[PDB]
Design an enzyme around this catalytic site. Sequence first.
Site, PDB file in Angstrom:
ATOM      1  N   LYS A  12       0.731  -1.012   0.025  1.00 55.28           N
ATOM      2  CA  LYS A  12       0.170   0.127  -0.009  1.00 55.28           C
ATOM      3  C   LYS A  12       0.871   1.265  -0.027  1.00 55.28           C
ATOM      4  O   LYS A  12       0.162   2.348  -0.235  1.00 55.28           O
ATOM      5  CB  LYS A  12      -0.767   0.001   1.156  1.00 55.28           C
ATOM      6  N   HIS A 122      18.940  11.323  13.146  1.00 54.27           N
ATOM      7  CA  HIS A 122      17.801  10.689  13.566  1.00 54.27           C
ATOM      8  C   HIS A 122      17.179  11.775  14.513  1.00 54.27           C
ATOM      9  O   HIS A 122      17.847  12.202  15.333  1.00 54.27           O
ATOM     10  CB  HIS A 122      17.856   9.583  14.352  1.00 54.27           C
ATOM     11  N   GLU A 192      19.256   0.927   9.184  1.00 54.84           N
ATOM     12  CA  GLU A 192      19.436   1.753  10.136  1.00 54.84           C
ATOM     13  C   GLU A 192      20.667   1.557  10.946  1.00 54.84           C
ATOM     14  O   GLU A 192      21.759   2.106  10.832  1.00 54.84           O
ATOM     15  CB  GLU A 192      18.349   2.249  10.653  1.00 54.84           C
TER      16      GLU A 192
HETATM   17  C1  LIG Z   1      10.392   9.108  13.365  1.00 54.19           C
HETATM   18  C2  LIG Z   1       9.775   7.809  13.907  1.00 54.19           C
HETATM   19  O1  LIG Z   1      10.455   7.005  12.822  1.00 54.19           O
HETATM   20  C3  LIG Z   1       9.902   5.331  12.894  1.00 54.19           C
HETATM   21  O2  LIG Z   1      10.312   4.776  14.124  1.00 54.19           O
HETATM   22  C4  LIG Z   1      11.809   4.906  14.358  1.00 54.19           C
HETATM   23  C5  LIG Z   1      12.074   5.092  15.843  1.00 54.19           C
HETATM   24  O3  LIG Z   1      11.519   6.315  16.518  1.00 54.19           O
HETATM   25  C6  LIG Z   1      11.468   6.427  17.868  1.00 54.19           C
HETATM   26  C7  LIG Z   1      12.736   7.028  18.355  1.00 54.19           C
HETATM   27  O4  LIG Z   1      13.803   6.036  18.326  1.00 54.19           O
HETATM   28  C8  LIG Z   1      12.823   7.672  19.754  1.00 54.19           C
HETATM   29  O5  LIG Z   1      14.026   8.019  20.408  1.00 54.19           O
HETATM   30  C9  LIG Z   1      11.585   8.854  19.552  1.00 54.19           C
HETATM   31  O6  LIG Z   1      11.782   9.616  20.898  1.00 54.19           O
HETATM   32  O7  LIG Z   1      10.484   7.908  19.724  1.00 54.19           O
HETATM   33  C10 LIG Z   1      10.344   7.505  18.167  1.00 54.19           C
HETATM   34  C11 LIG Z   1       9.189   6.637  18.462  1.00 54.19           C
HETATM   35  O8  LIG Z   1       8.287   6.495  17.320  1.00 54.19           O
HETATM   36  O9  LIG Z   1      13.533   5.118  16.308  1.00 54.19           O
HETATM   37  C12 LIG Z   1      14.216   3.869  15.851  1.00 54.19           C
HETATM   38  C13 LIG Z   1      15.499   4.249  16.279  1.00 54.19           C
HETATM   39  O10 LIG Z   1      15.887   3.279  17.284  1.00 54.19           O
HETATM   40  C14 LIG Z   1      14.111   3.642  14.142  1.00 54.19           C
HETATM   41  O11 LIG Z   1      14.698   4.878  13.614  1.00 54.19           O
HETATM   42  C15 LIG Z   1      12.495   3.697  13.794  1.00 54.19           C
HETATM   43  O12 LIG Z   1      12.332   3.498  12.418  1.00 54.19           O
HETATM   44  C16 LIG Z   1       8.239   5.440  13.124  1.00 54.19           C
HETATM   45  O13 LIG Z   1       7.737   3.954  13.176  1.00 54.19           O
HETATM   46  C17 LIG Z   1       7.692   6.338  14.124  1.00 54.19           C
HETATM   47  O14 LIG Z   1       6.184   6.277  13.989  1.00 54.19           O
HETATM   48  C18 LIG Z   1       8.376   7.868  13.777  1.00 54.19           C
HETATM   49  O15 LIG Z   1       7.732   8.294  12.566  1.00 54.19           O
END
Ligand SMILES: C[C@@H]1O[C@@H](O[C@H]2[C@H](O[C@H]3[C@H](O)[C@@H](O)[C@H](O)O[C@@H]3CO)O[C@H](CO)[C@H](O)[C@@H]2O)[C@@H](O)[C@H](O)[C@@H]1O
Length: 231
Positions: A12, A122, A192
């Site tokens: 999707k 990030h 990543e």
């Molecule tokens: C930006 C984020 O990207 C996907 O999730 C990433 C995940 O996001 C965490 C982040 O690690 C944490 O420090 C922050 O405070 O909260 C986010 C919770 O969504 O981080 C990990 C790194 O460990 C990966 O990069 C993941 O892809 C996504 O699923 C979230 O919805 C959001 O868009």
Amino acid sequence: MRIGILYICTGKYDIFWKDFYLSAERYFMQDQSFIIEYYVFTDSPKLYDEENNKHIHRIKQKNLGWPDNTLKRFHIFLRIKEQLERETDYLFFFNANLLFTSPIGKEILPPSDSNGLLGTMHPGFYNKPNSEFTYERRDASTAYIPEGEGRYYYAGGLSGGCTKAYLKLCTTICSWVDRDATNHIIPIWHDESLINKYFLDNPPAITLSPAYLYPEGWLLPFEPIILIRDK
Ligand SMILES: C[C@@H]1O[C@@H](O[C@H]2[C@H](O[C@H]3[C@H](O)[C@@H](O)[C@H](O)O[C@@H]3CO)O[C@H](CO)[C@H](O)[C@@H]2O)[C@@H](O)[C@H](O)[C@@H]1O
């Protein structure tokens, strides 16, 4: 001159293309100096505007399911590898769900004299100390990093460089991906996790701020340049 964009929407996820594409046409690298090619890896039959635009290259790629969708990224890029060396000076990968809010110029291109390679910080980790970085910690993975090691935590969803330099990264990392499979290891954060190691050995010539990764509905002390759409 030529900017390759690598983009993957299967299942999707194709519902992201239309707007990503549109915004890209308005904001991303718009100067007559640049010609943008779009390599859109997907299992969907037809993209948006794909009929009118000669720079939209649909590449038929079946749905691999999670995590392999993200995990196999450089496997999937490398299919057109030889095409990519032909048609592009620079490569950049965008997570499906990005949206361009503001103009992006040549400011982001790695120099010649560099290793030039690019990575984004990030958004979740830009304000945290490295103990907090989610680096793969098992010395059993190729993606492993020693505790208290590393400068930044880099995001999966935006990376790039000189076409030759970013491909070496695709093959290199593609191989790490394969080695871990032989050990039945899947790095915690997948591609990543692995890109962070590569950027440990290879500090990136350009480190872009979290403004380029600004999440939709988070408050951050930047202007969003690129936005991350929320599902
Ligand atoms: C930006 C984020 O990207 C996907 O999730 C990433 C995940 O996001 C965490 C982040 O690690 C944490 O420090 C922050 O405070 O909260 C986010 C919770 O969504 O981080 C990990 C790194 O460990 C990966 O990069 C993941 O892809 C996504 O699923 C979230 O919805 C959001 O868009």
